[PDB]
Ligand SMILES: COc1ccc([C@@H]2CNC(=O)C2)cc1OC1CCCC1
Ligand SMILES: COc1ccc([C@@H]2CNC(=O)C2)cc1OC1CCCC1
Ligand SMILES: [Mg+2]
C-alpha cells in the first residue's frame with residue numbers, strides 16, 4: 001500500500017538524519033521532523049489510508065487494461081467490461097417592491113409569501129431564473145417552468161412549521177445571492193448555477209417535519225427503504241427529479257444528454273451535502289480550500305477542476321441552508337419560532353409514540369435563547385467564518401450581522 | 415488550520431533548512447498519492463473530536479447545557495425436517511453432508527428441494543450453527559421468512575436467482591468456519607453475515623446498476639444512482655421481516671437488532687462491484703498489519719477490523735464461482751453469460767448500445783473468464799488466502815487450475 005511505504009521512506013530519513021548556531025538549527029529541525037512524523041500517523045483514519053491504497057490499485061489496473069484493450073477485439077471486450085464494473089392588483093405591487101431586493105441578502109421572504117398567495121418558492125424561483133436569464137439560456141418555456149415550480153411547491157408540506165416552501169424559497173434566494181459574490185465571477189458555468197439553484201429549491205421537498213433520527217427510530221418506510229442513511233436527503237432528491245416526469249414539467253428537456261447527466265450528478269452531490277451529519281466533512285473541505293486558495297487579479301477566486309468547484313458549491317448550499325442566524329433579527333427571530341414549533345410537533349409525535357422525548361422537542365423543557373447561542377457558537381459561526389475567509393472581503397457584513405444576533409440571543413437568556 | 419497542511423507547513427520548513435533523496439521521494443509521494451477525500455477525512459476527524467470535547471463540557475453546565483449539547487451532538491456529528499417439502503429427501507440429505515464443505519453441489523440441493531435451495535441451505539446452516547436456539551427463532555418464523563425471501567428471487571433471471579443466493583450463503587457459512595478465524599466473531603456477527611449473504615441479491619432484475627441508471631429506471635431515480643441494486647436488495651430483505659410470522663429478529667434486544675441492521679447494511683452495500691478496489695485495499699492493509707494469536711487464530715480487535723473482514727468475506731463469497739470445482743464453475747459461467755445475453759436483449763429493445771459481454775456473437779467466454787480471474791478473482795482470493803494462511807490454499811489451487819483450463823479453451 002502507498003502510506004505504509006511512504007511512512008517507511010520518511011522513517012528511514014529520521015534514522016539517517018541523526019547519522020553552536022548550527023546546533024540550534026540542527027536540534028530545532030530534528031524535533032520538528034519528529035513532530036510531523038507523529039502528526040502524520042495520528043491524524044490518520046481507516047478510510048484516509050485506504051483511499052490512497054484503493055486509488056493506487058485503481059490506477060495500476062487501468063494501466064494493465066489500457067494495454068490489454070490494444071491486444072485483440074476480445075482483450076478490448078474484457079477491458080471494457082472490467083473497467084466499467086470494478087472501477088468507479090395591490091399584492092402584485094408590494095410583491096414587486098419586495099422583489100427589488102432579490103439580489104440583496106436582506107430580502108423579506110415572509111412578505112414575498114404574503115404578496116404571492118403563499119407561493120414564495122414559485123415567486124422567488126421565477127424571479128431568480130428571469131434575473132439570471134436561465135429560461136432563455138437553457139430553452140425553458142415559462143409554461144413548463146411554472147408547471148414544475150408549482151408541483152414542486154405543492155409537495156412542500158403546508159402543515160410543517162419550518163421545512164415548508166418558505167424555507168426552500170429562503171435557501172433558493174440565499175444561494176442566488178451567494179452566487180453573486182464578486183469573489184466568484186466567471187468561476188461557475190451556467191449549468192453549475194442552474195444545478196445550484198435547482199438543488200436549493202428541491203433540497204427539502206416532501207419534508208415530513210421530523211428528523212432522520214426520528215424516522216430511523218420509528219422504523220419508518222422511508223428509513224427502511226433508504227437503509228437509514230441520509231433518509232430525507234435521498235427522499236428530497238427522489239421527489240425533485242421524479243416531479244420532472246409530470247405533464248409538461250420537464251425543465252431540463254432541452255439540455256443535451258451530457259448536460260443532463262452532469263447536472264443530475266451535481267444536484268445529487270449538493271442535496272446529499274445538506275445532511276447535517278455531513279457538516280464537519282463540508283467544513284473540513286472548505287477550510288482546506290481557503291488554505292490553498294489562489295486568487296486571480298482584482299480579487300476573483302481561481303478554482304480549477306470540477307472537484308474544487310463542487311466543494312465550494314455544496315458548501316454554498318449548506319451555508320445557505322444555515323443562513324437564518326446571519327439574516328436581520330426581524331427575519332432570524334421568525335425562523336427561530338418556526339424551527340421550535342416544528343421541533344415541538346416532533347416531540348408531540350414522540351409523546352404519543354411513547355418514545356423518550358428528543359433533545360429540544362418538549363415546549364415544556366425547551367431553552368431556545370441559550371440554544372441559538374450554542375447553535376451559532378459551535379456550528380453557524382465556524383461555517384460562516386470559514387466562508388467569509390474564502391470570499392474575503394465580501395460577506396464581512398453577513399458575519400457582523402451574525403455576531404450581533406448571537407449577542408442579542410445571549411442577552412435574552414433568563 | 416487543517417492537519418495535512420499543518421504537517422507540510424513544518425515538513426517544508428524542515429527541507430528548506432536541512433539543505434535527502436528518500437525525503438525528496440516521499441516529499442513528492444506524500445502529495446501525489448494524496449487524493450481529494452483522503453486529505454478531507456484527516457481534517458473532518460480533527461473538527462468532530464474538537465467539538466465533542468466542547469459539548470462534553472457544556473453538558474456538565476446546566477440541564478439546558480445538556481439539552482443543547484445532546485441536540486448538537488446528535489445533529490452535526492455522525493453515528494419440515496429439512497425446511498423444504500421433499501419425497502426425494504434422502505438424496506437431499508446426502509448432498510447436505512457437504513454443508514461445511516466448499517465442494518457442496520448447490521445444483522443438486524436445488525434438484526432435491528423442488529427448486530428451493532435457499533430455504534434448504536439456510537435451514538441447514540441455521541441448524542448446524544444452532545442459531546435458531548441461540549437467537550430464539552421458532553422454526554415456523556424461519557421457514558416463513560425463508561420462503562418469502564426465496565419467492566422474491568426472480569425465477570426468470572438466469573444467474574441472480576435463489577440458487578446464486580444459496581451459493582453465497584453456503585460459501586459464507588464455509589468461510590466463517592476458517593480455522594484462522596475461531597473465537598473472532600460473535601454469534602450476532604455470524605447471524606449478520608449469513609443473513610447478509612442470503613438477502614445480498616433479493617429481487618435482482620437481471621440487469622446492472624449501470625443499465626438501470628442509463629434506462630432512467632424508477633429504482634435508479636429513487637436511489638439517486640448510487641448502489642441502486644444493493645440498496646434495493648437491503649430494502650426488500652428488511653421489509654420482508656414485516657410479513658405475518660416472518661420476523662426472524664423479533665426475539666433480539668433493541669441493541670442486538672440495531673447492531674445487526676448496521677452490519678447487514680454494511681455488508682450488502684459492500685457487494686457493489688464498484689466498491690471492489692476499496693474492499694481489496696482494506697483487506698491488503700489488514701494482511702500487512704495482521705496479528706495472530708497462538709496456534710494460528712487471527713487477532714481482530716475493534717469492530718472496524720472485524721467488519722472489514724466480514725464485508726470482504728461476503729464479497730469473496732459472491733466472487734467464489736471460479737474457486738469452485740470446474741463441474742460447478744462451468745455451470746456458473748453459462749448462467750452468468752445467459753443473464754448477460756438477456757441484459758443485451760433488453761438493451762436491443764431499448765435501442766441502446768449493446769453492453770460489452772452482452773452479445774453471443776461478440777462474447778469471448780473463455781478469454782473473459784481468464785481476464786476476470788487474472789484481474790479481479792485471483793488478486794482478491796490471493797489476498798484473502800494470505801490473511802487466513804495456510805487455510806484457503808485449496809481454494810487458490812482450484813482457482814489457479816480453472817484459470818489454466820479456461821486459458822486452454824481460448825480458440
Ligand atoms: C433558527 O434556528 C434554526 C434554523 C435552522 C436549523 C436547522 C434545521 N434543523 C436543524 O437541525 C438545523 C436549526 C435551527 O436552530 C436549532 C438550534 C436548536 C433548535 C434548532
Ligand atoms: C462465472 O463468471 C462470473 C460469475 C460471476 C460474476 C459476477 C456477477 N456479475 C458480475 O459482473 C461479477 C461474473 C462472472 O464473469 C464475468 C467475466 C465474464 C463475464 C462476467
Ligand atoms: Mg435538507
Ligand SMILES: [Mg+2]
Nearest residue numbers: 614615685686
Ligand atoms: Mg449485489
Ligand SMILES: [Zn+2]
Nearest residue numbers: 167203204321
Ligand atoms: Zn433545509
Ligand SMILES: [Zn+2]
Nearest residue numbers: 554558658659
Ligand atoms: Zn403463521
Ligand SMILES: [Zn+2]
Nearest residue numbers: 578614615732
Ligand atoms: Zn451476488
